Design an enzyme around this catalytic site. Structure first.
Site, PDB file in Angstrom:
ATOM      1  N   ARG A   1      62.532 -15.148  52.483  1.00 39.38           N
ATOM      2  CA  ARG A   1      61.819 -13.889  52.647  1.00 39.38           C
ATOM      3  C   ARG A   1      60.365 -14.047  53.063  1.00 39.38           C
ATOM      4  O   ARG A   1      59.910 -13.361  53.959  1.00 39.38           O
ATOM      5  CB  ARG A   1      61.987 -13.035  51.358  1.00 39.38           C
TER       6      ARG A   1
ATOM      7  N   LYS B   1      40.095  -5.019  63.560  1.00 42.87           N
ATOM      8  CA  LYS B   1      40.999  -4.126  62.865  1.00 42.87           C
ATOM      9  C   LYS B   1      42.243  -4.929  62.510  1.00 42.87           C
ATOM     10  O   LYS B   1      43.330  -4.688  63.035  1.00 42.87           O
ATOM     11  CB  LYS B   1      41.367  -2.931  63.735  1.00 42.87           C
TER      12      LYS B   1
ATOM     13  N   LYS C   1      25.999  -0.362  67.617  1.00 42.80           N
ATOM     14  CA  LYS C   1      26.780   0.860  67.648  1.00 42.80           C
ATOM     15  C   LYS C   1      25.825   2.020  67.419  1.00 42.80           C
ATOM     16  O   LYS C   1      24.629   1.830  67.187  1.00 42.80           O
ATOM     17  CB  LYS C   1      27.792   0.886  66.516  1.00 42.80           C
TER      18      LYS C   1
ATOM     19  N   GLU D   1      27.833  -0.826  72.236  1.00 48.27           N
ATOM     20  CA  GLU D   1      28.855   0.186  72.382  1.00 48.27           C
ATOM     21  C   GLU D   1      28.248   1.526  72.843  1.00 48.27           C
ATOM     22  O   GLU D   1      27.331   2.058  72.200  1.00 48.27           O
ATOM     23  CB  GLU D   1      29.508   0.347  71.028  1.00 48.27           C
TER      24      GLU D   1
ATOM     25  N   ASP E   1      33.256   3.217  75.001  1.00 51.62           N
ATOM     26  CA  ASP E   1      33.979   3.895  73.953  1.00 51.62           C
ATOM     27  C   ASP E   1      34.583   5.218  74.365  1.00 51.62           C
ATOM     28  O   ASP E   1      33.872   6.190  74.531  1.00 51.62           O
ATOM     29  CB  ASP E   1      33.078   4.086  72.747  1.00 51.62           C
TER      30      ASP E   1
END
Lengths: 284, 284
Positions: A104, A139, A171, A200, A221
């Protein structure tokens, strides 16, 4: 394939998986039905088509459960291999009780890493004939970054930032505190002059403002394809050295369109958040 | 909401996420642009509709980066809340540098958990007006099992096995070594009489064989709807106490169809492997 950093991360992850699995007691059923002396030839076989990644992590799980010489690999495929549905990725001979305990954790891991590599390979095919490269993001899932980063690379992607101190990324938040994007850009340049400066922007207005400052990379963006085309045109004429990366409204259906504008990279967070497992089983 | 075990798992996961992020140095850009004395009100806001889960995990991340009293929660939603697109899940005031450092780890974790809860909620809706409950599996990501399990519960699903020793599950491998399914079944019963006995079958013939043995649960491995209907009919007449769980060829489009046959559970591995992030941002 796995580097030292990746090997350590892999060991740490497998160790975590096994502990979750063994925290409540051993597999009482295999103890009761399969003798210690039993040994089999088992195969990791895909139930579906995709790109394989994480095979070394499978061997590492066995090492942990059976000991380095607890099994024998009769055959295996190389990580990165594009594979059809009933493909035997790896065939080995090992103690049956060990295989059933490792199963597993082993399958959960290679299935996840193959899912990522599979998806990135699709993105890569989508933008082919373009100069664009498929890049990942931060992410990622806690505890699984090195491995997920490794798998996008196996799929043909290129890794971006590994952490927060990796590069300087300005940012909106930094822009605000600085006053403006160019204010922030300057501040950081003055504070960490030896670090890659990436900024960004979410508007062609901010783009025009930062281009002359010549940061290492500008992340577009959520730009429409037409604005991305424009941004490439202005970059090519005003700051040819500035790399451009699309981030935001990207889907595999729109990938080639964005790529065709000439951007250098496509930042795809979905490669690591939102992953679909590559269904693989252990056949004995 | 989080149990003892889950809260520990959570702290370990956030700890791992932060270490991955801070391993290469601090966020040089917020250090350069935002003063230590800075404070803001920021909001976690969804960019899409779904079911929220893991909000406590957000708070745990702040405790780690900011210290338990390093921030103030001005408002928050409860985990399990069905939420529309621009919904503020949580509003807080905190030291700005701390928020920017915690941001990515915190968003990665609640986005994933929300992703799971949202998906399970869909499965639960799919089978409503049926007696079927949606259950999860051991197909979890290494190191994230307690959290993933928690998230399916939040979406209305029911947790199944937490580990290998959790319950006795007789599969193909065990059957062979035992000789037959009933052989394996008896062996385990005799070895761990206090343990829930679950047996996995892949044919109606094996089903007929094990029903009289009355195991606690039988997992119908990859049965067609017609075969599932037959299995239910046979169980109802021969062993009313045996629970039946469909495992295998399940999709959200077919879920109701399977559910309508009368099975007791739908085992959905996709709830935990294959999860799609609920897009959430931290707006300042």
């Amino acid at each position: 394939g796995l580097s030292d950093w990746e090997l350590a991360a892999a060991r740490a992850a497998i160790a975590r998986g096994l502990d979750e699995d063994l925290r409540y007691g051993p597999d009482v059923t295999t103890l009761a039905t399969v003798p210690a002396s039993a040994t089999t030839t088992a195969s990791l076989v895909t139930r579906e088509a995709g790109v394989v990644a994480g095979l070394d992590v499978a061997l590492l799980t066995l090492n942990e459960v059976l000991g380095t010489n607890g099994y024998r690999v009769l055959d295996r495929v190389e990580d990165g291999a594009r594979v059809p549905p009933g493909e035997a990725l790896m065939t080995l001979e090992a103690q049956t009780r060990g295989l059933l305990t490792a199963e597993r954790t082993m399958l959960n891991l290679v299935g996840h890493l193959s899912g990522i590599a599979t998806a990135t390979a699709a993105w890569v095919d989508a933008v082919r004939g373009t100069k664009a490269k498929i890049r990942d993001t931060r992410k990622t899932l806690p505890g699984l970054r090195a491995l997920q980063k490794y798998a996008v690379r196996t799929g043909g992607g290129v890794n971006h930032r590994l952490g927060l101190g990796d590069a300087a990324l300005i940012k909106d938040n930094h822009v605000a505190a600085a006053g403006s994007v160019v204010d922030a850009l300057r501040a950081v340049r003055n504070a960490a002059p030896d670090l890659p400066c990436e900024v960004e922007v979410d508007s062609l207005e901010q783009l025009d403002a930062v281009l002359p400052e010549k940061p290492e990379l500008i992340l577009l963006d959520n730009f429409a394809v037409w604005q991305t085309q424009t941004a490439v045109q202005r970059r090519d004429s005003r700051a040819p050295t500035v790399m451009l990366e699309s981030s935001g409204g990207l889907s595999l259906q729109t990938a080639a369109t964005y790529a065709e504008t000439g951007v250098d990279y496509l930042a795809v967070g979905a490669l690591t958040h939102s992953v679909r497992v590559l269904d693989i089983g252990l056949d004995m």
